[PDB]
């Protein structure tokens, strides 16, 4: 599910509040950190973020700021 709207609306804070409240596993991930110049193993950070998640399912991959791997181009 996408969340969007201007800066400061409360998005990040919701995400944290609900995932802890219901006890669904909250993975803390930030978008630029997947961009690494080890690419192939930095692309494998993406692969392993799903690998962890499939064992730790059900799980919520909250990616904070989606304009680095959510680029138009």
């Amino acid at each position: 599910a996408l969340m969007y709207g201007p800066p400061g609306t409360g998005k990040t804070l919701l995400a944290r509040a609900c995932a802890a409240q219901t006890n669904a596993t909250f993975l803390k991930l930030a978008a630029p950190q997947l961009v690494q110049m080890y690419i192939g193993e930095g692309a494998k950070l993406v692969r392993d973020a799903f690998a962890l998640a499939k064992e730790k399912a059900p799980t919520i991959i909250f990616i904070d700021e989606l304009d680095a791997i959510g680029t138009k181009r």
Binding site: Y38, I39, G40, E41, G42, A43, V46, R47
Partner: protein, 215 residues
């Protein structure tokens, strides 16, 4: 009772039960040794692997002489190595993987080819299936798709009649959401042939040159 000699069969009934109870202890023990037998073999097999040593794989890069072979190792640097009389010259060709020892470096046996750990992950994708008509209204696009794809694959023999070059390769293009990957999965299932399903970026590695090797 019937008799005071039924006082003597009170004691004899017990003896009988004991005898029919020691037979089932005799079946107990014959089942207990054969349970321990496998536990000895499970560890005997581990001994035999342990007192052996590993092999290090090469492939025949070039024949040099009768007993001398040039290999290029899967770890890299080339060697000249020997052969036992456990392999034939008529049983070796190039690009055939060979064993070497890690203590004398001599070929004892022929080894099957290797194939990426990566490409085995692609054959384990097959989910996302849909029927043969699984794209509504784009059924016409299925017809175009099989003419390159399903028909010469099954029978090249009707295309000899036509006399043209062997059909190869197709591009799907269109804005996102039009089931380009869905059409990919659907022609994988229906044909039922070996199928991959390569990620664009699980065939890239940090090292520039391993990225070439995979494909």
């Amino acid at each position: 009772e019937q008799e005071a000699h039924n006082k003597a069969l009170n004691q004899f009934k017990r003896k009988l039960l004991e005898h029919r109870r020691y037979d089932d202890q005799l079946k107990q023990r014959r089942q207990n040794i054969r349970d321990l037998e496998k536990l000895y073999d499970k560890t005997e097999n581990d001994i035999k692997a342990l007192q052996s040593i590993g092999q290090l794989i090469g492939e025949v890069m070039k024949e040099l002489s009768e007993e001398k072979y040039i290999v290029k190792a899967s770890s890299g640097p080339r060697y000249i190595v020997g052969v036992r009389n456990s392999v034939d010259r008529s049983k070796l060709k190039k690009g055939v993987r060979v064993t070497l020892d890690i203590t004398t470096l001599t070929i004892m046996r022929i080894l099957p080819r290797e194939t990426d750990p990566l490409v085995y992950n692609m054959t384990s994708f097959e989910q996302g299936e849909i029927t043969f008509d699984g794209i509504g209204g784009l059924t016409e696009q299925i017809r175009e798709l099989r003419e390159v794809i399903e028909l010469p694959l099954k029978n090249p023999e009707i295309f000899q009649r036509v006399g043209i070059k062997p059909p190869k390769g197709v591009l799907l293009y269109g804005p996102p959401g039009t089931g380009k990957t869905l059409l990919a999965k659907a022609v994988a299932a229906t044909i039922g042939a070996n199928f991959i399903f390569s990620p664009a970026s699980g065939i890239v590695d940090k090292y520039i040159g391993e990225s070439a090797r995979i494909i």
